[PDB]
Paper text:
Insulin is a small protein hormone composed of chain A (21 residues) and chain B (30 residues), and it exerts its biological effects by binding to the ~340 kDa tyrosine-kinase type insulin receptor (IR). The evidence for the structural impact of the crosslinking in the analogues reported here comes from three crystal (analogues 2, 10, 11) and two NMR (analogues 8, 12) structures.
Analogues 8–10 indicated possible superiority of the i + 3 over i + 2 cyclization. This was examined in the next analogue, 11, in which the azido precursor at B27 was clicked with propargyl at B30. The full insulin IR-A affinity (103%) was regained in this analogue. The full IR-A affinity (103%) was restored in analogue 11 by expansion of the crosslink from position B29 to the B30 site. The LysB29→Gly mutation removed also possible side-chain interference at this site. In contrast to analogue 10, the crosslinked-loop is not in the plane of the B-chain; instead, it bulges sideways to accommodate the longer linker. However, as in 10, the cyclization within the end of the B-chain did not interfere with the dimeric properties of 11, allowing this analogue to maintain a regular dimer interface, and to form a typical R6 hexamer. In this model (not shown), the C-terminal part of the B-chain in 11 passes under the αCT-segment and folds back to embrace that segment on the other side of the αCT helix.
Residue numbers in the entry:
A (entry chain L), C (entry chain J), G (entry chain D), H (entry chain H), J (entry chain F): 1 to 30
B (entry chain K), D (entry chain I), F (entry chain A), I (entry chain G), K (entry chain C), L (entry chain E): 1 to 21
E (entry chain B): 1 to 27
Write the structure that this text describes.
């Protein structure tokens, strides 16, 4: 089941907010 | 990585602030 | 208004879906 | 970058892919 | 700007919730 | 359609159900 | 739990982005 | 897993839509 | 409350409305 | 145009994350 | 259909396009 | 209220933490 995919969708939204103008890297493997 | 840390158990704001640039 | 900030939320979700396992860097304004 | 391009006019998913690692 | 695109994203989420088992068509 | 009706002003749940199958 | 409901919500958003002007039909079950 | 936390994100959005101008209170677990 | 009710099985929009102010 | 409605959708998601187990009240125009 | 196909395992963009109009 | 404050200009995490219970 796509649990990790669903989690990541919400994680990137949370990083967008928390990081703001600093920005962020997202890559699932590492 | 973030997925191992934060999809297994919930990450705090302080912890999420770790994947910022 | 905060429309550019709202757009960015949707853009990160779109990049999440398109990039998959490759990941991405995101930062508003660069 | 991506905001100036893709929040002004709609980006295709091929355009978006240019911003992937 | 892309506001009609943005609004349409929220509309399809709303139809998903409201329509339930009926589903919907979006074009 | 729904974009004209429901992005120019807020649609109720009942209004939105016009677009269900 | 409601995971098939949650996944459907993400599917709708993905079809919105992928299908573009084509649009889509969504009806759970078929 | 973080599935209950993910569910909550969707629930808040659903309440936002259903309650409209009435508003709501939300807190996980009560 | 709402999580125990509506994250275990799907709540209708009538059930959800019970949690509005 | 529904700008305030679109903004609020994102605001409630941001409150959900920032407030976590504390929870929050949301009611437009107050 | 799409739930069975694409919630049991990840679907590509091309897989998802089967469900477009 | 939060709409006046946060839909006119972007709210910080500190500012959002004001509408928490
Ligand atoms: Cl989810
Ligand atoms: Cl928006
Ligand atoms: Zn939006
Ligand atoms: Zn989700």
């Amino acid at each position: 089941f796509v649990n990790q995919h669903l989690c990541g969708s919400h994680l990137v939204e949370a990083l967008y907010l928390v990081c703001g103008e600093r920005g962020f890297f997202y890559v699932p493997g590492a | 990585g973030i997925v191992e840390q934060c999809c297994t158990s919930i990450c705090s704001l302080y912890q999420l602030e770790n994947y910022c640039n």
